[PDB]
Each structure stands twice: as structure tokens, then as C-alpha cells.
């Protein structure tokens, strides 16, 4: 329980884009209250081999950060859409059609004109004006927030205890939220 | 002790719970409650009674 | 037996198998909010 704990699995909130709070993986537990030492020892080696994978998965995939579940992810640490620039082939020459029309020709329908060899091409930035920060998506909640294997739980001075497992806890208030 | 013992919010010391689905019989009586413990609260079930 | 130890028929007392923060919480608040009868201690002959 302290040596081989149950991992705290994180609850996502798709609206705020943050983790709600982590509770232990109670719903994937395996029942060896009817097993003996030939099989309790084999299941406890699977509880511990899983916890080695989750520490290995967090060392590969989770972003190194001080506060677990921060409230505003920076724009450099959030996956952002960076598309290719949009290449716009402009259909009509503007000042070559105000000279045909002033000369008396009625243009209708629609190089693309037979009376103009000129062709304008415009290249526009597709991405946003400012990079987005504040909340991670679903796919970055999968990469980060690997379930926390919390060895020897709640034994270190308080304040070092993980309060960001709790779904009521504001980090910048250091208090649990209420109904008002 | 002053701090971190008693809350500074409003909170009822005692709650009242109406049954959700009661069922009367000639030989017995069934009462189904919602024992709703609010957030930031603990309830010792020795303090609960009918 | 691993199931006597899981149900605390034999093994460590509540000062030892519980988390050390909960033991310090139940020791401080003992005079007004007792957590003592919530956890089972083994008595081994």
C-alpha cells in the first residue's frame, strides 16, 4: 500500500482544459482475497511492474514542471496549430478591368482574362495572431498527466502533500473551494 | 486552536433528510434516503439516526 | 497470512500501517474529533 501503491488516475475537464483531480485506480483493481502465497506474490509483482511502467511513461512523456496540474499552461508548452501559409491566386487584375470598363466594354462572367496577362498571387499567414496559452487539449492531457504512483503516501510534511489531486483545490489560493 | 479547526463558511450542524422512496406494508416499513455529505465535510455515522 | 494482514487481524497497529500524516492528524484532534475507533488494531497472542 505504501511500497506498491495504487496509481492516482487523473480526471480531465474538457471545458477548462485542465485536470480535475486524481483519485486512485480503484476500478481496475484485481481481487486476490481468495488467492494464496503462490499467487498473491505473483499479483503484487504485477502491481509493482505496472508502477515501474508509469514512472517510465511519465519520464518519457510528461513535461517537467514544478506545480502538478498548473492552472495556465504557457504558450510554448501547449501544442499549437502551425499550418502552411495560404497561397491565394487572385482572380482578376483590378486596374486592367477599370480601363476596359471605362473604354466602354461590359465585362461579365468568370490567363483568366483574355485581355490581361498579369497574374497576382497572395500568400497569407494561416496561424493565429498570438500563440494560445492557458489550457491543454485532450491529446496533451494524454501525454502529460500519466497516473501518479505516489509512494509512501502523505508521510512528508504537509504542504508537500499533493493537494492538486483534490478536485476542490485552487493552487493560487491554497484553499479548497466552497459552494460560494 | 484558532485557525484550520472550524470553518469560516456557513454550514448546518444537523441536517434533515426526507425519504426519497418510502414503501409501507402491513408487516414492515421501508424508507430510502439520500445521505448526501456535502463537500469539505465529514460525517461520522454514529451521529446519524432515524 | 496476507489476508489477516489486509484485514488487520495480525500485523501492524494503526500507528504503523496508516499514512503518517493521518496518524498526526488523529493525534492532534483526539480531544474533539476522535479518529481512534475507525481503525482496527491487531492483538496477537
Amino acid at each position: 500500500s505504501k511500497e506498491i501503491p495504487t496509481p492516482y488516475m487523473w480526471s480531465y475537464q474538457p471545458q477548462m482544459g485542465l485536470a480535475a483531480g486524481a483519485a486512485q485506480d480503484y476500478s481496475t483493481r484485481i481481487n486476490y482475497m481468495s488467492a494464496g502465497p503462490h499467487m498473491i506474490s505473483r499479483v503484487n509483482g504485477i502491481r509493482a511492474h505496472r508502477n515501474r511502467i508509469l514512472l517510465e511513461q511519465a519520464a518519457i512523456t510528461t513535461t517537467p514542471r514544478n506545480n502538478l496540474n498548473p492552472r495556465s499552461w504557457p504558450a510554448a508548452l501547449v501544442y499549437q496549430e502551425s499550418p502552411a501559409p495560404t497561397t491565394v491566386v487572385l482572380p482578376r487584375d483590378a486596374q486592367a478591368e477599370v480601363q476596359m470598363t471605362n473604354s466602354g466594354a461590359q465585362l461579365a462572367g468568370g490567363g483568366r482574362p483574355s485581355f490581361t496577362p498579369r497574374q497576382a498571387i497572395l500568400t497569407l499567414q494561416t496561424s493565429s495572431s498570438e500563440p494560445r496559452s492557458g489550457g491543454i487539449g485532450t491529446l496533451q492531457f494524454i501525454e502529460e498527466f500519466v497516473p501518479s504512483v505516489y509512494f509512501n503516501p502523505f508521510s512528508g510534511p504537509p504542504g508537500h502533500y499533493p493537494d492538486q489531486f483534490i478536485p476542490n483545490f485552487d493552487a493560487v489560493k491554497d484553499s479548497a473551494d466552497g459552494y460560494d | 486552536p484558532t485557525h484550520d479547526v472550524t470553518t469560516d463558511r456557513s454550514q448546518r450542524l444537523t441536517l434533515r433528510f426526507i425519504p426519497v422512496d418510502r414503501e409501507d406494508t402491513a408487516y414492515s416499513y421501508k424508507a430510502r434516503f439520500t445521505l448526501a455529505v456535502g463537500d469539505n465535510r465529514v460525517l461520522d455515522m454514529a451521529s446519524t439516526y432515524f | 497470512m496476507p489476508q489477516w494482514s489486509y484485514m488487520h487481524i495480525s500485523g501492524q497497529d494503526a500507528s504503523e500501517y496508516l499514512s503518517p500524516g493521518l496518524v498526526q492528524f488523529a493525534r492532534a484532534t483526539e480531544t474533539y474529533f476522535s479518529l481512534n475507533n475507525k481503525f482496527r488494531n491487531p492483538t496477537v497472542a
Partner: peptide, 29 residues
């Protein structure tokens, strides 16, 4: 160490005992 939750007898917290956290009450043993 949750000693600000204990009533101060004097200048020190009146913490309980470690060995009082459990129970062993059982009929006949």
C-alpha cells in the same frame, strides 16, 4: 505536523498518543 489543530496546554500542543489510533475491542478478547 498538524500541531496547530491541538489545544495548547501552556505553550505546547496537547497531542494524543500514537498507540491510541486503532481499536482492539472485541467480545472476550
Amino acid at each position: 505536523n498538524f500541531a496547530s489543530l491541538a489545544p495548547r496546554h501552556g505553550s505546547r500542543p496537547f497531542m494524543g498518543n500514537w498507540q491510541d489510533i486503532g481499536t482492539s475491542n472485541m467480545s472476550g478478547g
